[PDB]
Design an enzyme around this catalytic site. Sequence first.
Site, mmCIF file in Angstrom:
data_model
loop_
_atom_site.group_PDB
_atom_site.id
_atom_site.type_symbol
_atom_site.label_atom_id
_atom_site.label_comp_id
_atom_site.label_asym_id
_atom_site.label_seq_id
_atom_site.Cartn_x
_atom_site.Cartn_y
_atom_site.Cartn_z
ATOM 1 N N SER A 46 0.898 -1.160 0.000
ATOM 2 C CA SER A 46 0.000 0.000 0.000
ATOM 3 C C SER A 46 0.918 1.187 0.000
ATOM 4 C CB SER A 46 -0.828 0.050 1.297
ATOM 5 O OG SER A 46 -1.545 1.290 1.428
ATOM 6 N N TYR A 83 -2.075 -0.894 10.279
ATOM 7 C CA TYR A 83 -2.047 -1.306 8.884
ATOM 8 C C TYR A 83 -0.690 -0.942 8.256
ATOM 9 C CZ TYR A 83 -3.368 -1.784 3.953
ATOM 10 O OH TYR A 83 -3.408 -2.125 2.615
#
Lengths: 268, 272, 269, 272, 270, 271, 271
Positions: free
Chosen positions: D138, D151
């Site tokens: 990401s 995350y």
Amino acid sequence: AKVWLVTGASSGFGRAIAEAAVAAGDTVIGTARRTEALDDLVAAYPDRAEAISLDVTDGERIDVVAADVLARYGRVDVLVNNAGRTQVGAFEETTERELRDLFELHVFGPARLTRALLPQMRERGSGSVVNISSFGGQLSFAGFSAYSATKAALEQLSEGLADEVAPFGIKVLIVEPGAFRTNLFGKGAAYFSEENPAYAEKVGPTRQLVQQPGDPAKAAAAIRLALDTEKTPLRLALGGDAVDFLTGHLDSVRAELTEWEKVSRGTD
Amino acid sequence: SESAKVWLVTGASSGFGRAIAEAAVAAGDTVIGTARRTEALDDLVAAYPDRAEAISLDVTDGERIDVVAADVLARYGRVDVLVNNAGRTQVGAFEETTERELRDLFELHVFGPARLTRALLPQMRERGSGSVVNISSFGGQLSFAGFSAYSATKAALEQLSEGLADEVAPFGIKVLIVEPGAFRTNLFGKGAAYFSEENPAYAEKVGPTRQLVQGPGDPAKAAAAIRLALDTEKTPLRLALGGDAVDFLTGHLDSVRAELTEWEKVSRGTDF
Amino acid sequence: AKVWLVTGASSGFGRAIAEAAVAAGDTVIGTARRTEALDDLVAAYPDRAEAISLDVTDGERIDVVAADVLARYGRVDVLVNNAGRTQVGAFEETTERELRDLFELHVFGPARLTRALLPQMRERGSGSVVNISSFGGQLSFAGFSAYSATKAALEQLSEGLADEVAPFGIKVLIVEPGAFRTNLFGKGAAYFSEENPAYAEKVGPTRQLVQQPGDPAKAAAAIRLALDTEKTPLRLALGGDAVDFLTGHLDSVRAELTEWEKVSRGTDF
Amino acid sequence: MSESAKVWLVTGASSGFGRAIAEAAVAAGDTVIGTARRTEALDDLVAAYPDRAEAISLDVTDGERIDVVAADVLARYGRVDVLVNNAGRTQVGAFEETTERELRDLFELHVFGPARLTRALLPQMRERGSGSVVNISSFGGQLSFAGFSAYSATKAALEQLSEGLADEVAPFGIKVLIVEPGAFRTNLFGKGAAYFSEENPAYAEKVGPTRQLVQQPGDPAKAAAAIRLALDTEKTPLRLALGGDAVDFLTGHLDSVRAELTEWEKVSRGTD
Amino acid sequence: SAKVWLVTGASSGFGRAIAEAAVAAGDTVIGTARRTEALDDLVAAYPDRAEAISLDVTDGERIDVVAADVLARYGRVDVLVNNAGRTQVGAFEETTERELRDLFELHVFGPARLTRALLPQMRERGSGSVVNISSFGGQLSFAGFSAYSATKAALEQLSEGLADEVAPFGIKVLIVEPGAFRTNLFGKGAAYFSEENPAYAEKVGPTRQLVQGPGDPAKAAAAIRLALDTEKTPLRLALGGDAVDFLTGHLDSVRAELTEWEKVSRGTDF
Amino acid sequence: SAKVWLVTGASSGFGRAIAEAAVAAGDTVIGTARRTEALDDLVAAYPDRAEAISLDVTDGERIDVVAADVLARYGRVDVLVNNAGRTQVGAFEETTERELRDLFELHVFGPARLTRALLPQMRERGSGSVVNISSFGGQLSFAGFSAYSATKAALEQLSEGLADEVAPFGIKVLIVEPGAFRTNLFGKGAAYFSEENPAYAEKVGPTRQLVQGQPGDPAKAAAAIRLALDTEKTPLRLALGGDAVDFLTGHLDSVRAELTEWEKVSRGTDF
Amino acid sequence: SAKVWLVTGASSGFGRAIAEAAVAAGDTVIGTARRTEALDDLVAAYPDRAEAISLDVTDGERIDVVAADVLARYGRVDVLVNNAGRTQVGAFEETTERELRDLFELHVFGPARLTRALLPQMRERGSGSVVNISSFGGQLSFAGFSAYSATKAALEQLSEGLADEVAPFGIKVLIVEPGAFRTNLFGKGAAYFSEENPAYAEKVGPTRQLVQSQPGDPAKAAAAIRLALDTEKTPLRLALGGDAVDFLTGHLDSVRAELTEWEKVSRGTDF
Ligand code: NA
Ligand code: NA
Ligand code: NA
């Protein structure tokens, strides 16, 4: 053609010993934590080398592997106990878990595997047990206590065994290397305890010592030479450095014994 | 007035440990003797009710080691001399020794003493004085038929001791490895002993070892020699006790030396 | 009068940070696996230095230590997550256990300590969290994958937290040292995986890197300088070696982003 | 199999980006093994491509099942040419709100799982001397902000594992690609599971916007074609950002990290 | 007519002499040991009549398996010899419960389970012998011998009760009560000695010496075979002069004491 | 002076009779039973010198707790009496391993553990008695009685070895060997009889008849025990009942006869 | 066409009599017992119509395996006889929970489990008998007999309920209520006696003596069971022996008299 089983065959002495046996026309079973660590030995000798997954720390797995190798090969002629690791730290800094782990790898595992393979050697009337010790198997110094303790325990199990199995023609060889190069053959894992100010001056140099002169291939050739001599030595030191530590320690132990001999004998 | 030295003796209820404990109390020291059952030490405490204490300790039990060590420090303030004596005699062929037997011997002779020593080291260090006396054997340097497990445990204890000695010398801490032969078991009794089954493959070799371990040292003289070793300016690393220990040790030194000499060319040839 | 709690205070960088705090007039609680290593510090400053026994791998013991400190001291103003070890291994040569163990020391342990001590900082409206990372927190290379992964995790926990607690007046500082001299403050623990010939050419140099120029006392002073600034930097690299590694990695990431930008932006609707 | 065809193993292949990647592979004439928790989710793709697509049940959280599934694929297919570590979950919440359990769980999915799967397939790649490891990260792999700490921590860990491995395995002709997308349109491909922590008053202002962001959408089909371009380029980039959002986030963060390093440089260098 | 012998603890000392005697006379022998390899020398010497089977007699499930397996492959067991065990010396106060339980397992519970496993087929045939290796200590004890005597006496009374029950089935039960035998040919069994503390050393010392060491184990094995070949097989067979003397001394002292107190004993009638 | 008695299996048989005789003689008694209520009458008759404590002798944990509690509150135990037990009759092959182990727990392991727990304070004081309720069965067996005799004999031999060891400390060990005793006034332990098939009935039948029933008075047995304990030389064994005496003599005679019969073969193994 | 009989506790006494009478009548028999030894002669004498299976009815898993094994090899069971059990005597207060539970396992739970496993094949066929060996004790009790009576009464009422349910399927249920039977020919079942408490000796003593010659002929008892089953209207209950008949009519007399005496009170409680 002899059947060799070599633990810790993916690096250091184990790898060099495993390569020298296949090169001499022998059949080799090499064990490592990951089978794939021996992918190059097996792909070059698809017929005479095998890799097997073995954690010498796992007694259950030892019995499975010993039995499977015996089943598929019918025998083990030479057992080489080379699985192990380097450990440096102050006595006080060594945790019980770190101590017990090192003993699993250097003592209990090798003893269990040795015990599993001994009967077929005894019954045959031939065989070799080659135990990879250190100059540390006879002596210690700052930072090396856990390590020396494990190797000395291995050495004394070997001495005792050797006396017992001589009648059956079984060779027991205690190999005592000093420092060897790692660029060509790699090395086993190594852990270095935190150094606290109280111990740094003493332990520091041992860290350097363990972290050059020795050729692992020449070492493996000397092992084969010793096994193939009429009278196989119980111990074979390898490297000028190992020899120097060993003689210096023999010297000081004898000196102290003589000094205190009258006291010692007077307790009769 | 001076504070009396505080001795902690493991496996002090019989044999050599009872002689060492006796030696300490008769010389005026304070002694904590340990045993699996405190009642094992009734005769000691009855004789020295002011200077001797019996504490229950199984050296195989790491949690209990820590409890005893902490308790002794809490009530005596210090330990001056630690004697790791607890243990047993064990005889059996390598092939005949079970893993459980081997592990149990390492607990008693290696892991327990290592844990107890670690627990008492810091107070020796902060004070800058102290003695660790590890009761080994001539078997801490050598082995032969039937003696593999015993020698393995004692050599491990000796090597832990060698390393430690080098590390604590700067702190004024003495480390003494004691290497006795067999002692008379007359007044002090004898320690526990286990003998593996001897089968015909090993009987001729293992048999004599059983006899060697079963039966002439003087444990009081041995106990005095320890104290002498501790009182001397240059405290030796090793103190063998008795004629047989000296003979065994010298014969092993010679054999090892002769083998090294013979094989030295080959040993030195492994360099680049 | 500030209360500092410094993990791994036993040696190296942690010892230097704790030593700098007491020399500045602060109160320090140093933690280590074994208290016996901090004894001289406690001896020199008996009223203002304490040593506590803490293995940051042990969640229960973190909870107990944190609660005990807050009960006896009333607060912690500066938390320093410094406990850890150096580690070197080829990716393939790292066992799952060697990986997880490093994540215990560098990530899960610090995360748990930080959560426990965060409420009191938030209620007071002040506090600093100082997370000891490395140039490795942003970059990696042969032999350094496990180490870099743990430190990068620690950095990103720190980034998210920093943004969250800024409104509470709480400072978060990621410290990125190169290598320090350890003849004065003592060398930390080090783990090295089994070496494989196939990887030696690559991992070799990294082992040698890990196994000199940095002054840890100067580093501690730099930390306090950064903390004393109203807008605390998110990151504080320490040593020319670290700065060089970081600018090298930033250059290559930047060039890559530029080269592939048309393709990147082309994937939107 | 056609001579030029590749074996792709895609974790989390039943929805979202992993589905798009799996689908792009079959369309390009490749052979695909897609994994998911419920294999039945991939029924419609297997039915459309009977001989070139397989669904295998796998929780990447389950390491024993990883080893079994990897051995199975290698036994039956002979190889894996491209591994895509795609399985994952979106997660949002304040650092203080995240439980140690939720954090460890996300590390299992995003880090330990892929690490084990990669390790299991790397040796056949090395022996063959070709292969690709594609790790779906990401923009969060390089940066974080309120509500995103767990995350980002996991993606950054995966990225650095990849960086290190990439350096080690380049000599063997193995490609390691870190993919850094933003959010994707979900109308055609669906999405993965998602958990959003309780937002307490003290954090609502900071974390709220992150929840909105995580929930300018990417086109997963074009994103999958870009992965394939990157892998087919002689110089494969270590990182492939996907979408304007990811590019903005990543370039904005590099800018700030660099500026800060510049500002503090004299202090940084002064520590010799 | 060849007989099938099953001898537990057959690898060393007395059991090995019993195994030897059997195979030398043309019978079939299954010898047991914790490790089959302990028996390699017997199997080597008698490949066609001897087999080694792994059995830990403290493992009840393994006992059932081994007994069934022997029956499945030999079809019968004619003579069972419960020989497995160890010497054990220590003061009652020093003996741990674990040490006491382990000795009962070896010397009592294992033998009982094995005997039970093999009795049905002897009843079915209408012949068989159960030979239990006891000691003079099965009838008497003294300092340091409490645990040992306790296990041997239990084995003896199981045997006495069993003998009385199975006589009608043509089954023989023999309790062998050996003294000290030479261990120079077939090795010695295992032995455990407790710590001997000052409070017990004077009494327990001499017992350690007694079990540590005059008898011919080959003659002992012949005497067992003779006792079984005899129409009226004695319930007990003492072996060695030392055994006879111990046993006679205890008979004398038990009888003297019974008589001394007899008037008191008889006066408790309601 | 007054003695402290701890009596296991105090609610029935010899245990009950011995407990009542102790308190009547002015001694202090701790009686144990699985159900403390079984001792209500004793405690009501002697509220100040009798206590009931719950104890299952098969539970070594509970043995440790009770021994320590009694030593803590009374300061000592002078006389330990082990009477906890049960009776079983059945063919060797009929006896389950479970029944066999349970009998050994009651008659051997439990009493051994309790004895070991109380021996040190006897040894330290230099006085004390251990009274083990055995049977003529502790020296002999016959059809139907293998399990029972094996447990009682085990107890006897533990007692012999112990007695030899602790004679130097002035500790008395008394093995009580009763024959058949009335149960209508003192009651008795539980009794189990295995199935008795025609193949074993001729041999086992008589043994069932013998243990089910009569001649013996347990109050007189209790007095004889106290008499043995109060005498200068306490016998190692006290048979009780002419029936036990005849059993024991018959067994001595046949054992001696068989020893003599085979003696030449016995002595022939000597080198 | 010969019927398949499954008989529990076939090892001695009544169960053995029943198994033998079934083979003599030309039937096929599976006798079950904890140990099969006693059945060797029956099996060898009738190698094709008699089989002995080891079954402890206390072990539910084993019940299931054995029921399944017999159904698969024989195809059916026509007559199930629940006969496994033991004699038991003890005062209610002397009965431990374990003693009470063990007896319920033998006489109630095991038989219920075996019946349940075999009922479906009877129901589907439209024929079968379930023969439950109770006692006069299944209807009445007295000092020392409470546990035994409680277990047999529970078995009887399970049987009464079952009989009413399976009548329409053609299945017969027979509760057999024996008195005391001779044991010299067929052998003697297990017997358990609780600890004896002197407070109960005068009441319980006589009951102990009751269960410890006997009038009943087990072979004649087996013949009567067969006649009862051969009769179209099989009685629900079959007492055997004059002693049983006398105990039972004694109990019916007293219950009838008491009901009559208190009827007005009883009926006065209606709303
Ligand atoms: Na000895
Ligand atoms: Na009890
Ligand atoms: Na009866």
